[PDB]
Structure 1
């Protein structure tokens, strides 16, 4: 059989793991609701790198629009779920 039926929870753990793998974000201060621009003190260029890391982790490309407006991990998780049509 193919890969297991990916759920919201696993998506969240993978997103959080990728984010704490980023050397410019302290792990303990990061939350699923932290805002990259204000809470994490990350600039626009930094955000582009985070989106590319998400692209590598989840194996699909996010256009310049779409990806640009994801400012915190929850929006990334929601976008990934909506693209993959995952409801659980």
Structure 2
């Protein structure tokens, strides 16, 4: 009998040495979780000591957090180095708050 609900074959084997817990499939398209991105961004934001992280709400513009244009560029480049990605020119200049950055990093599959 041929079971069409079973679609596994030798092509779909997804056992890797590095991962002790095997992954769901062989597509390496796993994105980061929301809390991980926020925690790493907060770690990056610690260097900019004019920003208070205690009751930081992410929908505020960069200016109201205490960052001017140069500090905005430095912070965006720091996050960009942190996740080992690049922001396209339109995406880099279109960022207004940390929520948009969080969403963009969430949608990215190359972020590590």
State if a TM-score over 0.5 links the two structures: yes
Higher RCO (C-alpha under 8 Å, 6+ residues apart): 1
Q: After the TM superposition, which residues 2-81 of structure 1 pair with which residues of structure 2 at under 5 Å, given as runs?
A: 6-28=32-54, 30-37=56-63, 39-81=64-106
Larger CA Rg, structure 1 vs 2: 2
Q: How many matched pairs?
A: 84
TM value normalised by structure 2 = 0.62
Q: Find runs of 4+ consecutive structure 1 residues off by over 6 angstroms.
A: none
Q: Which runs of 5+ in 2 are unaligned?
A: 1-17, 24-29
TM value normalised by structure 1 = 0.75
Would the aligned equivalents of 2:62 and 2:96 in 1 still touch at CA under 8 Å? yes
- Give the superposed CA RMSD: 2.4
